[PDB]
Design a protein around this ligand. Structure first.
Ligand SMILES: CC[C@H]1OC(=O)[C@H](C)[C@@H](OC(=O)N2CCC[C@@H]2c2cccnc2)[C@H](C)[C@@H](O[C@@H]2O[C@H](C)C[C@H](N(C)C)[C@H]2O)[C@](C)(OC)C[C@@H](C)C(=O)[C@H](C)[C@H]2NC(=O)O[C@@]21C
Ligand SMILES: [Mg+2]
Ligand SMILES: [Mg+2]
Ligand SMILES: [Mg+2]
Ligand SMILES: [Mg+2]
Ligand SMILES: [Mg+2]
Ligand SMILES: [Mg+2]
Ligand SMILES: [Mg+2]
Ligand SMILES: [Mg+2]
Ligand SMILES: [Mg+2]
Lengths: 110, 58, 117
RNA sequence: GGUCAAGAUAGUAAGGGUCCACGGUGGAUGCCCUGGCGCUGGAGCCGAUGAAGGACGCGAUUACCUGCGAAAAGCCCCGACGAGCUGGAGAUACGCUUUGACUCGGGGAUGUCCGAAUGGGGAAACCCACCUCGUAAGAGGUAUCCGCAAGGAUGGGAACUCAGGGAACUGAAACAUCUCAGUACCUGAAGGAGAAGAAAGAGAAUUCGAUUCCGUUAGUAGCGGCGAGCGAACCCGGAUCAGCCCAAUCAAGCCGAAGUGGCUGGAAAGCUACACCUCAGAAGGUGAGAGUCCUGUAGGCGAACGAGAGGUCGUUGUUCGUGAAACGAUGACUGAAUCCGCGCGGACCACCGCGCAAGGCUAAAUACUCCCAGUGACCGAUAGCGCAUAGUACCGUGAGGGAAAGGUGAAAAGAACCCCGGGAGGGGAGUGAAAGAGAACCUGAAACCGUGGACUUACAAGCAGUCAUGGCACCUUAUGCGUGUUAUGGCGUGCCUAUUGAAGCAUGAGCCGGCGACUUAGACCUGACGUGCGAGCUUAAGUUGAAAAACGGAGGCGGAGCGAAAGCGAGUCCGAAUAGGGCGGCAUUAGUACGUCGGGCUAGACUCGAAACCAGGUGAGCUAAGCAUGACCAGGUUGAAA
RNA sequence: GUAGGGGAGCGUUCAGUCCGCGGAGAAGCCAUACCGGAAGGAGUGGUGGAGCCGACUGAAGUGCGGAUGCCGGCAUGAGUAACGAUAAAAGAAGUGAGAAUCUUCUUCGCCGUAAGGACAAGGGUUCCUGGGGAAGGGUCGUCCGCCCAGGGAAAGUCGG
RNA sequence: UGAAACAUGAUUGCCCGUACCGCAAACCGACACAGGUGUCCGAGUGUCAAUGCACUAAGGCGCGCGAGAGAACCCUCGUU
RNA sequence: GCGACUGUUUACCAAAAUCACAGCACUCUGCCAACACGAACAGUGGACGUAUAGGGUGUGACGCCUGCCCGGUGCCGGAAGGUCAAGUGGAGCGGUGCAAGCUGCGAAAUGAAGCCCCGGUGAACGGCUAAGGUAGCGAA
RNA sequence: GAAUUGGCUGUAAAGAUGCGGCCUACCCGUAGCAGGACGAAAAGACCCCGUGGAGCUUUACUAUAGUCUGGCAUUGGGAU
């Protein structure tokens, strides 16, 4: 059947990063990354919000109304922002920590 | 084999013509002099269980 | 490469199955019988084109001797008169005159009677 | 207006017919890919340290698959990665992880029971032992064949290799030699290849210089109930290239250039306006179509420590079929020479010439494809592998046989809540661009089943149409034009096959959809067209480059015929010189390579169908019998010998 | 004009080339009275929802009504034959959305060298309890040998 | 020089089978099929006897469509 | 009528007058028997038997019986001779080299079982040309 | 095959619901009956054909397992 291999089970963000949403509805909107699914290619950002219904008879009270929860995306959000908009990444070195390689572009802050 | 057998398929016409008498005749429904639910002539009213007085329970 | 029938047959079939209009039963609904009916229809088609031409002249002649006999004549005789009065070469139209213009038809009967006796 | 009479004519539709609208069924068609096929190249053995292939297990929850192995969805070490992970699993709970999880690359350590199976038994996965060490648990050993012993062998491999054994159908238009064919099949041995191999040779130049393979010679030489048919080798061109010994770079992986605004849209990657990168415009993804948004690509880096003798009899091999049959080969009998020696040169002799058997090894070029990568005038769900995965379900005692099945949406946002119903199912509300996508989820043909409307039908004889006219209806290629339908008239013997002759009471067919039959091959033969060179034309194997073609002249065809042949030659053959056959000049014109088409031949040769014949295997759980060991025959009558 | 020979073309898939079109709607499907001498081709509209037409040239698994052809779906016969031993069944009460068929009570009738009971073979959880009610059950089920979960099987002396 | 045999105490007691159907709706027969399937038990009354025949204990069952009707004909019967 | 009898047969259209049978006959077989299965100098059945036994073939209880033909064929037997294979035996003819030699074919006579030839044989195949039906039966 | 599936006499490939002519017949069912539909079923089993097959037979042809027989091996020593 395939799934999110078309990339390399490789993302461009971490479960902390602030990211802007390029493409579709919720375009430009920004938010913290709260769930990163690399193989599935999923991002849970405070962006796309959904209203999910609850099929819950026996399941903790039959009072299973409507829930406010955010619904995941792909690469339809360009990772990491600082000059107010979406960017690529190029300059790596080290901070105080040598073992780590940072990221940056036309500027130099992530 | 299966000795007398049909010679030709019977057409949609011919098949249908034979069914011109298969139509059910709707019951002649009467209205109960009491409980006022409909009933069958010469039978106890289903609803109240009446047939001049009350014979059957409910 | 592979080249399956797809679309070609169904189109070929719908064409035939549309010539089948007020065709009774299977003759309008199933291809093989619709098509088969048309082969025989072809015979009738080509034949009835040259047949109508005999059919009409027949109708034409019938109306002529009817009126010819109204004025104490007949087709055989009347036509010979018009033929004998070489001047008269109606042939086509002649039936409509008998049917619509009785005044006019009489004139031609009277002319035909002359050229003869 | 009324009664009576005489005529004529309408409407009814139980049900049917044609057409239209809307549906249901069903899964064609289109689009797609999660799956296959072929060719090219790579790589190529596994096992007593216990395989191939299995049984039973291991999960908080576990039926199936995966991975594993009581240390059990994993344990330890090294490396890479740098934030997620807790297998498919669409599933909650418990948790694990920058003191670097997960995954990937490389080692180890554990690996129940079965299987060569190996302690002994056994109806695989189970029974039953003995011996040594030991605190019990628990650990180690106990098979035969080789050899002193170290150490080797049993068994498994798709096809390929050699060997032992070896069909018949079929061709011969019958059949028996012959062909099919040393093919198919069985058996043995082995490897990544094997085989063969270092001249008692080929052979006619006193040339050659191990073998295998490819082109070619050449359908020549030859074999042949001289029939069907079978069919070499030498020379030459080419791939690769060795002769030696005895006996007396590629996987993990990291780095990697450059676009922004407006517009259409549910959604931009499209359109538009200006912009940049390019050793990178190959490719996949992202709400639609992508150089510059992600993964990448060109280019570069890159690992601790990881791979690369003669004879007679009988027969036979090769073109070798008893032929004039040489030579090899060997079952039976015999049986020599030793270099002024032996074997060969297609009976045989002499001469001339080639070569040293009776000991062993030997890489490369060759073959095949279980597996891996790349590619395609290969397939895209009746195709393609049997399988979009299953050797499953199902069938069979067994050998064996054997399916079909794909698709919500961009994302689960998988429809809370309401209404009828026990439910199923629906209607709403909400989500979404669309629910004209609702989980019997893309399109959704046709047969087939319905509801509704139009025109119609209850005195009618019918291959169901066709022509003509009238009536009714309708107006989106469509108002003189028709479109639908309908009454009456005329005319009218389904289709195919097979056939002297088919409506035939001759064959086939229930209907629809899909699948379903003149092909492909060969340096083959012969002809039409065509092109390029043209008295000449042309390459084959290969070699080198391959986002591609060039080289390669070995060989093939014209170029001289006539003869049985020697041979002679515009002549030649019968013959003793005169007649003639065939050929030349002809009055005289040309071929060759490739292509497409006609036809031929050889293969399954347009597709489908035998009865049968042959090979190896599976069956006596049915039935025919045999052997071993058990079981069974109420009751009554009759009344033998002794 | 049959066998047959000869000529010119239409259509399908794939390919190379060029011109393009497409979410302001591609292919496919559906309707049609338009065009061409025919195979056929176009316009408009309707559905669909992501790909595709035209022209030249090339190559084919290239055109179906037939084969008692193959696969699949659906018809006819037809609401027909049958519903599997002629050992019956009746009423009451109960349960339930629903009862000829399920439970219970009282009768009836059939077997009784069996139509009772105990092994063996063979089958494999069919056993018991609680639930279920799609399909299987020739009807119907509230029930079942069917479906779900839990449980149940005990040996020195019986078989091996 | 601590035998065998007996007697009384203690200890010991391995593995597989055992549910259920089993002349049948659970086995073989494609079916909940009028067939087939080895052994054992198999009561009473009557009838010479009996495992025969009739009825009946114990036990099991009424055979998983039903209800009317009372034609032709067809099946299985009774009488003539 | 047929078959003596009990029995056996065509699973699935034939139950019989079929087959079997007790009994009779011909015949082969001397023991590592004949005969049979088999790759086989294996092994085994025959048989852990031994001619009062075993194989084959026919007829089919019991009773009275079973005739004629030995030409053809088969089986057993004889052998005066004719015919016959490889082999032993090599007389002769022929090739080639100058030559010894090396070579190609090859008679006569001898050489086995078989066959022709003679006798036998019928509960041998058969017949009613080798003979033409003895009893008994007969329109079965 | 599809059916809008009458009788008589003809004709036709020679046994006509489908051709000709004449005749009869309003539409549709239910229970029944078997004359026809050359009714169904099994690509005639008879018959002939095919240079088809198989089973069987023999003094048809050819071979052959088996078996009889001469020679040569295993295979030797003495007497005539
Ligand atoms: C009992 C049912 C059984 O039928 C019979 O057995 C009867 C008795 C048998 O009659 C007979 O076989 N026979 C033999 C003669 C007497 C009887 C007969 C014949 C004709 C009519 N009626 C009886 C047939 C009529 C006979 O046909 C006849 O065959 C003859 C060869 C030619 C006849 N033609 C001319 C019409 C044909 O009918 C065939 C050959 O069968 C066996 C038919 C084929 C199709 C067949 O096998 C059926 C499937 C058959 N098998 C099965 O399981 O069921 C069937 C139907
Ligand atoms: Mg499809
Ligand atoms: Mg598979
Ligand atoms: Mg015929
Ligand atoms: Mg068809
Ligand atoms: Mg009844
Ligand atoms: Mg009544
Ligand atoms: Mg008898
Ligand atoms: Mg008897
Ligand atoms: Mg009847």
């Amino acid at each position: 059947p395939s799934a999110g291999s078309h990339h390399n089970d490789k993302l461009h963000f971490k479960k902390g990063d602030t990211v802007i949403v390029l493409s579709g509805k919720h375009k430009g909107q920004t938010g913290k990354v709260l769930l990163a699914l690399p193989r599935d290619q999923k991002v849970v950002v405070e962006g796309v919000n959904v209203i999910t219904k609850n099929v819950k008879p026996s399941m903790t009270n039959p009072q299973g109304g409507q829930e406010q929860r955010e619904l995941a995306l792909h690469a339809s959000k360009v990772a990491l922002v600082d000059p107010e908009t979406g960017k690529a990444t190029r300059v790596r070195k080290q901070i105080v920590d040598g073992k780590k390689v940072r990221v940056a572009v036309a500027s130099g802050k992530t | 084999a299966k000795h007398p057998v049909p010679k030709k398929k019977t057409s949609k016409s011919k098949r249908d013509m034979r069914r011109s008498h298969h139509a059910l005749t709707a019951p002649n429904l009467t209205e109960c002099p009491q409980c006022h639910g409909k009933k069958l002539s010469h039978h106890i009213c289903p609803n109240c269980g009446y047939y001049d007085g009350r014979q059957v329970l409910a | 490469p592979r080249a399956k029938t797809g679309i070609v047959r169904r189109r070929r079939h719908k064409k035939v199955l549309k010539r089948a209009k007020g065709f009774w039963g299977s003759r309008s609904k199933q291809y093989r019988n619709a098509f088969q009916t048309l082969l025989n229809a072809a015979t009738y088609e080509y034949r009835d084109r040259r047949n109508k031409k005999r059919d009409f002249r027949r109708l034409w002649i019938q109306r002529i001797n009817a009126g010819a006999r109204l004025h104490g004549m007949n087709y055989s005789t009347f036509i010979n008169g018009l033929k004998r009065a070489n001047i008269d070469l109606n042939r086509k139209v002649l039936a409509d005159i008998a049917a619509r213009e009785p005044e006019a038809f009489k004139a031609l009967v009277d002319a035909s009677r002359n050229a003869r006796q």
